[PDB]
Assembly symmetry: D2
Homo-oligomer: 495 residues x 4
């Protein structure tokens, strides 16, 4: 087990690749332009990263298209694609320490989280998806004797994947797993706030046996190369994870261009409903704190609204405060740290402004509330709780994407459901109760893509993940994720 | 069997409903405005139809939402929804003669087609979908012993369905069958060129037991009430059948509003590939003619590009010409008629302009090419064939939506495939060959949602139907149609 | 609603068919022999029924085989088979009053049960199965590009169905629905204790459009014609519902003959577990009584072992006694009657012998325990309860097939599960508890084909039904029932 | 690449384990008795192998049952069972040279086949099955609002697997893959003619992480320990691969004991149908020879009946003779050898007696026909062809299980199908034709579990494998194999 000093030495000794990757080779952007990749750990310069634009999108898509048409990957035997995807996952694990360190330096999450959650999670999405390839069957319809009706799935062709900065490698892998497994070529566009691991795994893909052109990586800004990919007339599908605002703009881009398929994973304001008859209130308290403090609250499914049955509120809230007190910001390179830096100054100022809005709209600060560790040259905020929140308050309605918890009360299950569903979002929700009927009926009534019962942040690769309403469309993970990267064909044969 | 005189008597004796339908009652538009519904068979006034706008969209959506929330239909037992949908289908059949007559008068297709194809096809979509409801199973994941992982589907809520004029009732039913079967409320917006059957079946739905508010019908223009539904902030999903141009606009509307799900069935320029080793050339010739002449060529999957192997071209083209000669425009109310009127003057001018374009771009007219029966006051054009067509010509690239055939030649299977896929569209295609390998390998290479082998216009309710590329996204018919009207939920329960 | 006098008039006015049915015609047995069909309601002669033997089995199998080979039904379009099966179900309903009367007279169940449960249940099995036919899809494997791998299902051919007397029509339909829907020819052998409804519906099948030879019916004894079918070298599959003893004998017959597939639905000793935290004790008490008294306890899944948590036992047992008191034997032709006659004298003696065994082995009689209504000439026994039962006692280990309840106690969930699973059987079980974890974990631990939670006798046509262990193999109802009547084929095509 | 001399040295240097394996340890049989394991390569003594009997079956099943009930494997997380199964497969590959050598020495197949087909094939069944575990989903029925209907699968408990000698390790793995993956305990009973690899992999299972008691191995005779397992009252399921005669006896044993589930893979007499319009006659000739000579014709799906369209017979048969001449018996330890020894003297004498019967019944010997290489001390027979065979001849009806081909002619497709289906068997069949319709219609009409088109011996792990009629019931490989090792449960929960 590596120490803080070990990680600090390794961080200093990294040579960091900043180039784009197109047709099997690292490359500068056509313009030669770069942007500074700055670490939120302490503000050090990590790398000058290629700043791609429309011209680079064009070259990457031409490369993607040529590779798809060659059939080198798209017509490779399923069992062979499986083997390659599993080797790809294996190379992530083999290079786990470097990749984890890049993630931590790039966007500030604790090294123990990068190493323990992100890298294994990314690898698992690649290998599980790979494992599934030849376990999938298409269909033969019930037809008259002189007909053979086949209903099959084929890869769409060229896929653009635009991903965010909060789980850079893992979110990339949630897309790459099913998209590559089904045989598509993918152009990956990582967040400008976290380009490094995406850039690095482009090389690993080649080493695993992914052909040149099949996985191209274009670092750069959303409003330049991201937009260019979404408007491209020869991209078949764009998959996206990010804000609801940008997600909507992608639907507009598709409409303005070639009617490409658009699949979105967007914001959340997930309600964590704790009933008086929860089987384990301490577990509910620990989980409620973890739900908002894990990864600095920079989680789409953060349990940012805590709904507590009023009769246990006075006992439960102090339990949640004490649990939250164990989540402490610190040096992300220290293995003992469980809360890291926020991704940058821009994000931190947004979070601080929402904390200010909590005060303004009349909520009661009961824990945290301040920026800390300023002397480090990094960006850190205390996990924060507001009590006495009404669901119409800004901190109840709007996604904060920091470790800021809103606490609301209710007195009936029906009110809990009404409050929980009172949102434009619908990514996740949780219910804590020992009652059989109340558990299933409440879960059934919540309009959310994931509903966790007597736990938070549940599910694994077998569980589809995605939004109701403005939290998105379509699902990541599970076999259902494959459907975003394929087209149905009905082949009706007269005999 | 009814005679022409019988159908003319019946046409005269219809009382035709023109009002919108909201919350279980026929109603004027809020503005009181109407538009004239004129028959293309000769020009008579059928009815003054309510011209709905945004205010009516709002009232209909409020009705739909309230109905959905009440659970009267959305939480009705699956077996009971099945019985209702089957009764709904049964009422279409019970009233087939009236509905077919309305269809024929409304948009000009032959009465024998309305009676023999449209009404049975529509009824079948409703009954088959109903039958399927309790044959569908959701999923239980493989999880650790202390977890129960449920993956289920739930109705999205409020669905707007916007449909075209070429198969008014049948297309409405393709949407209504699965949308209603899954438990949604639906707001149906029929084409302003063909509002009458949708208006009529609103009452039949009530009679079958569909609760008030669950199926609302808003006749009116695309740019008024259609647009209002697509921009509405409380519509969860819009499903669409129509032009690629408008389909794209709907993606923009969704992005501008509430990120509603958008499912599109759009245009086509389907290739009909006849190899020299086709098993039955006469069958191929008969189907090639039917593929362009049926429903006046106003068919999304019309075989508008006939690709013929050069070595049989001289023999096959005269066969296609002779077969096309049996398709003759005539009085739509005559049961002997197999080709009806074009939907309106605007449509006839478009077809005539494309025939002119055929000449201009250098193709050779070998059949038809002219308006006929002007004395009737109706709009009729001869089924038309151009030979010597290059795929770059306008008549080869652009959807005409009239009975105009382009004939192209090829020398190799590779060439046929390249030409076939050389289109922004991808709705359907056909292959004619007696060879096992060539049939399957060519079918596999064609980028289209339906591929018919040794037949044209194949499939039934078991066959998903929809586009690759700019022909749309998602599928109508089959069980896959249901997925457009539901959301996946992952319920992970800690035990 | 018909009165007792009405049903008695109708009983007198029946003309009852007693012949076998082969190749579209009613027929005597080859030997000319008959057996007396006597009613347990009072002892009248209903009909002299053909007593078939091996010669008749041979002729029926030859008819079945020829019909199968002709394709009249086996290669009939799926949608047409669906329509026929639905018409078949519709004829059962059209003739419900006659069929229910035949059932009640034949084996003694109350007329209100025959009319309200048996005939609708049978019709439902036929129509639901029919509806499902064209909703089923076979499979296409993930293969290399030069391979097409089809995995399809085909009817086995000739199916023998051997059924019992407790639900004569409904059990026959549980087999016929999926066996006929998949395209097989079926030879049905009803119990010699209840031949009449099977004989009758043979004609209804013809009327619905089932071709001659596809459904043959051979009334007669198990050891003659039943055995002949099970040993027949040209029967592909036998499906069976009856005793575990005979079920085992069928496996031996298959091994002695042609290795035909054997699917068994056999005996049961189902445990009904009521925890102290059951949500509704009165509902639990009412269901516990119904579970043993319904259809005279002549139910494979009768809740014959009531397991009660010791801490509610003193409160719950009087509730069960009072609820059982509402179940009173009476004239089966009286519509007010909720408990009918036992099927014959042999059955009554068996029940009385087990009541004697209850006393001998040391249990405590707390309700019923005696034959009643001897003056009627019929066979009736009081619903009976023994308290203080140990699971090692004969009444706890052996299936009684009468209305005799054994009451056992437990202190822990672990104990309840151990007792519940302490049986050679495994057909059904029930759990009553308001606790989420306990309900799912206990249901998971129970080795039984059906587990009902907070209800008894649950499920519908969507729920597969069948045994663990010596309660049988394979499942009736649901789509899984179809798999007993088809064979998988892997067609791997090199392209 | 190892030479013949290398393999001869390795064979001499093996230390061979002969003991049974129970509860994590090698053990003598209770009696202390052994049988001589003799090599058909040259007659050398390989090992004295434990000769288990009823007492050993009892101890193994008690061990299996205790392990299943402990949940160490049966309740282990799916993802963890997957990982263990993949490591298990990995250890087969890691020890491939030893395992391949054991197989070759034990039952005589060429070392290049053992190394290239058997070991990789066995490993692949284990890992593919393992990979599938968490890709499988169970079901949630469509039910009323106050019901939750779960349809799930659970392991049956204790599985007996009885396997033959022709593919000892691979057939064992076809059973072990799905049986262990679903969580069962397995008692494996290898053929007394080939016990060695089964004995050896028992240790590898433990090293991979399979808990003690979960995989027990009992070498010994069929009529002692095999029979004891099939009659055991606490074995839930027996799966079998072997002769039809013994397969039938297992059905009888189940009936005599506890009604255990019985799944059989039995004999074959597979027809290889070559039409005049086969796309590649040379390929058909090569494959027809391989179909009968591979693994000494000791293959269940050996293409033992060659049906050739009469018009190509005179040209085709010499092609088949020339191809068959490339398959030459030789030293199984020589890597160049492509035909090995027959398993023993008993088998060889059976084969020679069938060759004698070919002469007697009037067939024409056109190739091979004699025992060879007698001086080696081993058992070898020339690949043999009889022409002018009629389907009623013994060599056409009966399974020979040696390299003996029967050649038949036909003149119509209909006759080809009649002849092909004229058998009590139905394991596999093949069709060679370039015609689309004839390929699919003929394949559809053949009553066989596998149908190969324009190839022989096709399919991989995605293709279910097993018999129609007396070739067995149920399927090995694919996801369908899992169903033999699990039970369906319907859990209906009232809410
Ligand atoms: N599974 C999920 O649903 C999921 C997971 C993690 C994070 N998120 C969401 O991500 C957001 C935080 O991430 P973010 O700040 O990177 O979001 P963002 O919307 O600002 O950007 C996401 C990605 O889109 C790109 N982008 C920005 N503008 C673009 C444009 N005009 N056209 C094309 N691409 C453009 C960015 O460069 C980045 O790669 C939150 O709203 C959070 O809820 C969702």
């Amino acid at each position: 087990t590596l120490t803080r000093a070990d990680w600090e030495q390794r961080a200093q000794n990294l040579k960091i690749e900043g180039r784009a990757f197109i047709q099997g080779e690292y490359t500068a952007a056509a313009s030669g332009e770069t942007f500074d990749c700055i670490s939120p750990v302490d503000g050090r310069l990590l790398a000058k990263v290629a700043s791609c634009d429309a011209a680079d999108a064009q070259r990457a898509v031409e490369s993607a298209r040529s590779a798809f048409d060659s059939g080198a990957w798209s017509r490779l035997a399923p069992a062979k694609r499986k083997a390659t995807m599993i080797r790809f996952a294996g190379l992530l694990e083999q290079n786990a320490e470097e990749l984890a360190l890049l993630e931590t330096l790039d966007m500030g999450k604790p090294i123990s989280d990068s190493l323990g959650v992100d890298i294994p999670g990314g690898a698992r999405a690649l290998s599980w998806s790979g494992e599934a390839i030849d376990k999938l069957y298409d269909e033969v319809a019930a037809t008259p004797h002189d007909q053979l009706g086949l209903v099959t799935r084929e890869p769409v062709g060229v896929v653009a994947a635009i991903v965010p900065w909060n789980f850079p490698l893992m979110m990339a892998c949630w897309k790459l797993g099913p998209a590559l497994s089904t045989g598509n070529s993918v152009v990956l566009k990582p967040s400008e706030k976290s380009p490094l691991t995406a850039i690095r795994i482009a090389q690993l893909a080649i080493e695993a046996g992914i052909p040149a052109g099949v996985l191209n990586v274009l670092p750069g800004y959303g409003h330049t190369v991201g937009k260019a990919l979404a408007l491209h007339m020869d991209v078949d599908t764009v998959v996206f994870t990010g804000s609801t605002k940008i997600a909507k703009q992608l639907m507009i881009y598709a409409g303005e261009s070639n009617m490409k398929r658009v699949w979105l994973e967007a914001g959340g304001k997930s309600p964590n409903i704790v009933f008086a008859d929860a089987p384990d209130l301490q577990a509910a308290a620990d989980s409620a704190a973890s739900a908002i403090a894990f990864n600095q609250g920079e989680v789409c499914t953060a349990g940012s609204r805590l709904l507590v049955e009023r009769s246990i509120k006075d006992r439960f809230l102090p339990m949640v405060i004490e649990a939250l007190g164990t989540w402490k910001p610190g040096n992300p390179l220290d293995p003992a740290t469980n809360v890291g830096a926020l991704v940058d100054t821009q994000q931190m100022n947004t979070v601080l402004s929402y904390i200010a809005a909590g005060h303004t709209d009349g909520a009661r600060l009961v824990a945290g509330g301040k920026q800390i560790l300023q002397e480090t040259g990094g960006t850190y905020v205390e996990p924060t709780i507001f009590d006495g929140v009404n669901n119409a308050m800004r901190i109840a309605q709007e996604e904060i994407f920091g470790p800021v918890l809103s606490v609301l009360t209710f007195d009936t299950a029906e009110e809990a459901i009404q409050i929980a569903n009172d949102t434009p979002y619908g990514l996740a929700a949780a219910v804590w109760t020992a009652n059989l009927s109340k558990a299933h009926l409440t879960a059934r009534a919540l309009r959310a893509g994931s509903v966790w019962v007597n736990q938070y942040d549940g599910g694994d690769m077998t569980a589809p993940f995605g939004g109701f309403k403005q939290s998105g469309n379509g699902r990541d993970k599970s076999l259902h994720a494959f459907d975003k990267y394929t087209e149905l064909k009905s082949t009706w044969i007269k005999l």
